[PDB]
């Protein structure tokens, strides 16, 4: 992971089905396709992703102080580690099959659902700056304090002003 970013979302965002966790990780990494016969790269690409992660442990990293603070030559700080979970819980209304009356019929039950990436995009080798802009835009959208809303990319859109093709139903 060339770039990595950890953001803490609020209760309104966590309530959604796409943000069932409380921490979001944004990453940018480079992929290489290797020739099966001999080690020789054939194609290269950059990937921008975003997953809801959960804490699994801790580790020690160098301390980087900010303006008011000052650090020792060998000062270190401990930060948590994150991983992508397989499933996350939800709370949905239900009914008790063996309710004896009118007071124990309606209840709440918990279910597990599959976790899917928030963002998954692929960029070519000669488009590093566009990938960097996309990653920065995702980070800014998360910093604004709401859900990720803009996924538009100019390269993958259909032509504009071609009335003979855009007249067909799209809903």
């Amino acid at each position: 992971m060339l770039f990595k970013y950890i953001h803490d979302v609020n209760a309104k965002v966590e309530e959604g089905r796409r943000y069932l966790s409380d921490v979001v990780r944004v990453a940018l990494d480079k992929e290489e396709t290797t020739d099966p016969d001999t080690q020789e790269v054939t194609s290269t690409s950059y990937r921008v992703t975003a997953y809801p992660v959960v804490q699994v442990g801790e580790e020690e990293v160098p301390y980087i102080p900010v303006h008011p603070k000052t650090a020792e030559p060998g000062q270190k700080v401990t930060v948590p580690t994150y991983d992508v979970p397989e499933k996350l819980p939800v709370l949905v209304r239900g009914r008790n099959p063996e309710a004896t009356g009118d007071y124990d019929d309606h209840i709440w039950v918990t279910e597990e659902v599959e976790v899917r990436p928030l963002v998954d995009e692929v960029f070519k080798e000669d488009e590093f700056e566009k990938a960097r802009l996309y990653y920065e835009n995702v980070a800014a959208q998360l910093a604004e304090g709401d859900d990720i809303r803009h996924y538009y990319r100019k390269d993958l859109d259909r032509e504009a002003g071609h009335y003979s093709v855009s007249r067909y139903p799209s809903f």
Binding site: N10, A11, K12, E15, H106, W108
Partner: protein, 52 residues
């Protein structure tokens, strides 16, 4: 007369009477004011939602 009479009926004259307009009568109940999920949140933190 060696049997009962009208004055010996008690529960039938005490239960309130309402008029029915169909063979099925519906009414709505309120059971809870919300889930019991903890009220303390912290300084400057948006509290969680709740449903009755």
């Amino acid at each position: 007369n060696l049997s009962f009479t009208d004055q010996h009926i008690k529960f039938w004259k005490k239960i309130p009477k309402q008029k029915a307009y169909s063979t099925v009568e519906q009414y709505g109940q309120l059971l809870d004011y919300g889930r019991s999920q903890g009220a303390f949140v912290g300084e400057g933190v948006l509290p969680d939602t709740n449903d009755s």
